[PDB]
Design a protein around this nucleic acid. Structure first.
Ligand SMILES: Nc1ncnc2c1ncn2[C@H]1C[C@H](O)[C@@H](COP(=O)(O)OP(=O)(O)OP(=O)(O)O)O1
Ligand SMILES: [Ca+2]
Ligand SMILES: [K+]
Length: 430
DNA sequence: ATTATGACGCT
DNA sequence: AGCGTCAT
């Protein structure tokens, strides 16, 4: 009762750019705007691999992880933009720089955690408190929430999509004004007002649209964000959780989309997140470990405590290339040439990072895959990164992996290498 | 023959 | 440390 924590202490948002690499290419090339289009890397094998898809193209069934030749079967008029190639490899700089544009705007509003190239969590608790003081008990108008969905509403005693959105928003605001909701509900609502403002600023200042979720923690904000995409935001209140979770497949919750989630389903014989509430904390810990068990026990009740970390910059800077099928690296000089290409891109990015962000990487991680290996990485070795110099880094990388070569002929490399990976890590202030 | 990333957990 | 999981 009175001592039962409800995980309603924070306001957290997750902002997720819509079709991000496609928007970056559409801003650059107006011919691609409002068209079925996709971003592809490379072109020779089956037309290239699709890595991002506009919503117009998704209507035809085009997805990422599709070959462009196959996407064209579904959507013959699909437009394509190619990822830049430099030094023999795909180069993602344009998208990393577009990411910085958005992250810097978000940072004006609040502390953010960079979750990926186009996702950031936002801790809005303090901003909401501030806005509430400005507001002075003045009610919140629907006009302040023009792209907001309230999950679970409308309900109870119009067949258009926007009409439904407004009906739900009206019910929510009507209740807030009549004092039939909770202080956490008001906090979330003010959070959503701020996120409208944030999303408007992103679009104004970059041209890019995004979706967002607002809730009391990162997992619910992420779940919320996906409910209404694209170009919309969704508020998931604490009270919405029992209905929302009652039919929510376990794999939809972040961290449960893989083997752990499959084990939860199999071991417990359940399908939906809400079904977890019937187990004790000890029962869950007994199957999934102390940490996972406690996390699951709280999470299925809508409670999570993972903080929004104050981190706007990536912690690592890496460069990798696959060498599939017949293109696997089978000679010494091949391996060395590609290590150099990778090291040259890495040096370029590191030098920029050092100038921009007042830090230096101190460790170089070298990873390879060998042909036949089940896993993405076969071997990982570290060495010191003491100089931002591509020839040195590439020579050092060779040294730490050269003994993986089974070949008696040192000119040859066996078994052939199907992946090379260089990663700069362990930053120190500079 | 998805590819190129990136954070965090385990022992 | 080196490996594995989960995610954009
Ligand atoms: N598996 C991947 N391989 C390479 N690039 C990827 C991969 N997944 C995502 N990306 C890139 C391209 C995406 O535009 C960008 C952001 O990813 P993501 O949020 O999953 O999709 P998206 O922004 O294209 O569409 P959505 O509107 O559904 O969010 O990161
Ligand atoms: Ca996205
Ligand atoms: K994303």
């Amino acid at each position: 009762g009175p001592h039962m924590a409800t995980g309603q202490d924070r306001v957290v948002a997750l902002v997720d750019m819509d079709c991000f690499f496609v928007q970056v290419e559409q801003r650059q090339n107006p011919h691609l705007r409002n068209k079925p289009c996709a971003v592809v890397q490379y072109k020779s094998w089956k037309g290239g691999g699709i890595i991002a898809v506009s919503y117009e193209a998704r209507a035809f069934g085009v997805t990422a992880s599709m070959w462009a030749d196959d996407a064209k079967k579904l959507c013959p008029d699909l437009l394509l933009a190619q990822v830049r190639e430099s030094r023999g490899k795909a180069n993602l700089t344009k998208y990393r720089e577009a990411s910085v544009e958005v992250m810097e705007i978000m940072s004006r509003f609040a502390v953010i955690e960079r979750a990926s190239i186009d996702e950031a969590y936002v801790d809005l608790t303090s901003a909401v408190q501030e806005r509430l003081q400005k507001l002075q008990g003045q009610p919140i108008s629907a006009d302040l929430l023009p792209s907001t969905y309230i999950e679970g509403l409308p309900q109870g005693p119009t067949v258009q999509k926007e009409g439904m959105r407004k009906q739900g928003l009206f019910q929510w605001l009507d209740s807030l004004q009549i004092d039939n909701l909770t202080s956490p509900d008001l906090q979330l609502t003010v959070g959503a007002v701020i996120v409208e403002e944030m999303r408007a600023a992103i679009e104004r200042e970059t041209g890019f649209q995004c979706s967002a979720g607002i809730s009391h923690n990162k997992v619910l904000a992420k779940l919320a964000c996906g409910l209404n995409k694209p170009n919309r935001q969704t508020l998931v209140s604490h009270g919405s959780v029992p209905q929302l979770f009652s039919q929510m497949p376990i794999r939809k919750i972040r961290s449960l989309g893989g083997k752990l989630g499959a084990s939860v389903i199999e071991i417990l014989g359940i399908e939906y997140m809400g079904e977890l509430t019937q187990f004790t904390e000890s029962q869950l810990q007994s199957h999934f470990g102390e940490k996972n068990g406690s996390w699951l026990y709280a999470m299925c009740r809508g409670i999570e405590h993972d903080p929004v970390k104050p981190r706007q910059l990536p912690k690592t800077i890496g460069c990798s290339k696959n060498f599939p099928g017949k293109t696997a690296l089978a000679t010494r000089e091949q391996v060395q040439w590609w290590l150099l290409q990778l090291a040259q891109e890495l040096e370029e990015r590191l030098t920029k990072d050092r100038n921009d962000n007042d830090r230096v990487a101190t460790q170089l991680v070298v990873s390879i895959r060998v042909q036949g290996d089940k896993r993405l990485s076969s071997l990982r070795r570290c060495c010191a990164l003491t100089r931002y110099d591509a020839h040195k880094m590439s020579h050092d990388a060779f040294t730490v992996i050269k003994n993986c070569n089974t070949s008696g002929i040192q000119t040859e490399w066996s078994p052939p290498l199907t992946m090379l990976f260089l990663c700069a890590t362990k930053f120190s202030a500079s």
